[PDB]
Design a protein around this ligand. Sequence first.
Ligand code: VO4
Length: 296
Amino acid sequence: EMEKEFEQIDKSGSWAAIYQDIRHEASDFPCRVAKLPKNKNRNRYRDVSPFDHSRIKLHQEDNDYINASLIKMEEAQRSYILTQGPLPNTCGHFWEMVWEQKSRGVVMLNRVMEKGSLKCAQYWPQKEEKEMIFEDTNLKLTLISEDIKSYYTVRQLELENLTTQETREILHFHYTTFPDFGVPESPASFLNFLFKVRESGSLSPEHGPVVVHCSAGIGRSGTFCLADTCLLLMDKRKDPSSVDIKKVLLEMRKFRMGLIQTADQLRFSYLAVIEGAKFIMGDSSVQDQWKELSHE
Ligand code: VO4
């Protein structure tokens, strides 16, 4: 059981060890395409690649490569695309993927600048009146409205296939307050954010997979996906205890390497799942407690 194991690991001070065990046991698959020299400038990090078997392919004729993975959670029956923060030359590719995968939501779990560096290209419009055109992929992107809260912002974007003049509404969920070092302020603000994403519909099976990223698309993206899937699972079974966080994580690492980057992120994941489980099991009021504790 989850809380039991949590305290025991806390008491034994062995998160570093537990996490390192997950690292040792994690799947290792080839990333041949990511590593082709022609794709060198499509990767933000040398050490962060999509496996060949689970990578998302652009329907481009030219070069179908983007650093992005399909995490397909069979039992939970939810899918996620995890990707790196777009680069100045892959913003086009990014929206092409969003378009071709029929995604409804984009969860961004980083700020454009962190620790004094540029973690991500400015890949969406910041003002209604300056829409963005992506020439390489023939897509138009327009800011329709935005709802700024204390520690996250939700934007409504319109994505137009210039080739066919067909258009969609994309929801952009931007978590801005994950700390530079350490883990978010509390479970509460993080869970409050996840639940906003869930309520948007962006996770429904009727849409393509939600697109989730931070800078590398593994650490904070891992935490978000792991928590969502774990809660989803205990919701489906209404049995908090059959859910093995570490086992779920290893299952996700079959699809993308390095999900969850620090032992502290792992401990935070437990925290968020344990806390979020309160809501899952019939306690509706807990979600209102997170909204207030998040200070949005
Ligand atoms: O940009 V991330 O994979 O280190 O949280």
